[PDB]
């Protein structure tokens, strides 16, 4: 079972870097991995001090600050100021999708009874729910 | 339909097909890719001949050969990605659970929820679709990881 959200994020980060003439270095890999895996919301300073403590490889604060800006610009992370900006992964609300296997037709939908059961499932297992992915597959009326 | 949604279950199938080919020392070619794509995007239970003829009609530029059609089907059958009768083939579409993933430690919880299942059947009926499958992943942070740095 692969984590689709993480796989998507990692490919998008690499796509952006290839487009900017930049390499997927071990510094950049640990930065994205830290922001995805940690449940602490970092400032550029605390992200830089955290990676210093976990990986004295590198990595300087300039590299941290440029990588956060590339991520925010791409809307892969969101920042919030309050008095150093704190960052977290973007979890923009999105619709779910049903896809016709035969013609590729895509129908968007959102269902509040499903939404409510998804929060209940997280809660039954002690999880804090942060995102979801839900696709339905079938054959549309015109293809059938 | 103006929207780019990657079909996750199809990508999982293609990755498994790539794994099989690499195991059998075969290159992942456009000819082999179009065969898996035809099996998935159709309800027909093809035979090697009818699958050859369908690809010839739909993608004549690729010139997919009959030897490649049999060889690929035999490879997919040995891997249990397809089942056959007498031969006529059907892609395996085995029941599966839904999964919840901790973003920090990566632990996975498998689950099924009957309320969600019923809503999925109603959604499909409301749009005149015949439901054949689904995929649902929930993302979150487990009780061991909550407010913790990266494990
Ligand atoms: Zn259709
Ligand atoms: Zn965890």
Q: How far apart are CA A51 and CA A28, in angstroms?
A: 11
Strand partners, A96: A109
Strand partners, A86: A80
Q: Same domain for A82 and A51?
A: yes
**B111-143 burial, b if ≥16 CB within 10 A, otherwise e?**
eebeebeebbeebbeebebebebbbbbbbbbbe
3-class secondary-structure state, position A109:
strand
Instruction: Outline where B1-127 has alpha helix (H).
Output: 8-23, 30-40, 48-58, 66-78, 114-126
Q: What is the CATH number of the domain that holds A52?
A: 1.10.10.10
Task: Characterize the bridge pairing of strands B98-102 and B82-85.
Answer: unpaired
Q: What is the CATH number of the domain that holds A104?
A: 3.30.1490.190
Q: Same domain for B145 and B85?
A: no
Number of domains in chain B: 2
A72 is in an annotated binding site: no
Helix axes of B30-40 and B48-58: crossing angle, nearest 10 degrees: 110
Residue B15 Cα to ligand 2 midpoint, Å, equals: 26
Q: How far apart are CA B8 and CA A115, in angstroms?
A: 20
Please name which of B90, B105, B81 lies closest in space to residue B44, comparing C-alpha atoms. Answer: B90
Experimental resolution (Å): 1.8
Chain-centroid distance, C-alpha B71: 20
3-class secondary-structure state, position A91:
coil
Q: How far apart are CA A142 and CA A103, in angstroms?
A: 9
Please indicate whether, in this complex, the C-beta atoms of A38 and B104 are within 8 angstroms of each other: yes
How distant is the Cα of B84 from the closest Cα of chain A, in angstroms?
21
Chain-centroid distance, C-alpha A78: 10
Instruction: Write phi, then psi, for B101 (nearest 5 degrees).
Output: -120, 130
Residue B25: give the domain boundaries: 7-93
Q: Same domain for A78 and A55?
A: yes
Indicate the residue of B100, B119, B151 with minimum beta-carbon distance to A127: B100
Q: Same domain for B76 and B126?
A: no
Identify whether the C-beta of residue B67 lies closer than 8 Å to the C-beta of residue B60.
no
Chain-centroid distance, C-alpha B60: 24
Residue B22 CB partners (closer than 8 Å, separation 6+): B28
**B85-106 burial, b if ≥16 CB within 10 A, otherwise e?**
eeeebeeeeeeeebbbbbbbee
By the 10 Å C-beta count (0-12 exposed, 13-18 middle, 19+ buried), B74 is classed as middle
Q: How far apart are CA A54 and CA A42, in angstroms?
A: 14
Q: Same domain for B22 and B70?
A: yes
Q: Same domain for A99 and A83?
A: no
Method: X-ray
Q: Same domain for A82 and A102?
A: no
Q: Same domain for A69 and A58?
A: yes
Q: How far apart are CA B54 and CA B127, in angstroms?
A: 29
Strand partners, B111: B98
Q: Is B64 left (phi over 0), alpha (psi -120 to 50) or beta?
A: beta
Q: How far apart are CA A93 and CA B1, in angstroms?
A: 20
Nearest residue in B to A42, CA atom: B149
By the 10 Å C-beta count (0-12 exposed, 13-18 middle, 19+ buried), A134 is classed as buried
Residue B99 Cα to ligand 2 midpoint, Å, equals: 14
Q: Same domain for B58 and B132?
A: no
Q: What is the DSSP string of A21-43?
A: T----HHHHHHHHHHHH-SS---
Residue A125 CB partners (closer than 8 Å, separation 6+): B100, B109, B111, B142
Long-range CB pairs of B124-128 (<8 Å, 24+ gap) are B124/A98, B124/A136, B124/A138, B127/A98, B127/A107, B127/A109, B127/A140, B127/A141, B128/A140, B128/A141, B128/A144
Side-chain-side CA neighbours of B75 within 13 Å: the count stands at 22
Q: Which residues of chain B does A110 touch, with a Cβ-Cβ cutoff of 8 Å?
A: none
Q: How far apart are CA B18 and CA B11, in angstroms?
A: 10
Q: Which ligand lies nearest to the CA atom of residue B132 in the structure?
A: 1
Q: Which residues of chain A does B12 touch, with a Cβ-Cβ cutoff of 8 Å?
A: 2
Q: Same domain for B88 and B135?
A: no
Please indicate whether, in this complex, the C-beta atoms of A33 and B149 are within 8 angstroms of each other: no
The 8-class DSSP code of residue A85 comes to -
Task: Characterize the bridge pairing of strands B82-85 and A128-139.
Answer: unpaired
How distant is the Cα of A94 from the closest Cα of chain B, in angstroms?
12
């Amino acid at each position: 079972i692969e984590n689709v959200e993480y796989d998507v994020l990692l490919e998008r980060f690499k796509k952006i870097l290839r487009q900017g003439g930049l390499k997927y270095t071990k510094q950049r890999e640990v930065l994205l991995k830290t922001l995805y895996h940690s449940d602490t919301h970092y400032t550029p300073e605390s992200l830089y001090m955290e990676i210093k403590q976990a990986e004295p490889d590198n990595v300087g604060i300039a590299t941290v600050y440029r990588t956060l800006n590339l991520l925010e610009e791409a809307e892969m992370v969101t920042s919030i100021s309050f008095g150093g900006k704190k960052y977290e992964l973007a979890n923009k609300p999105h619709h779910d999708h049903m896809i016709c296997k035969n013609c590729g037709k895509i129908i968007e939908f959102e269902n509040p009874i499903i939404e409510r059961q998804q929060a209940l499932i997280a809660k039954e297992h002690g999880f804090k729910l942060t995102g979801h992915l839900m696709q339905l597959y079938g054959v549309c009326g015109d293809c059938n």
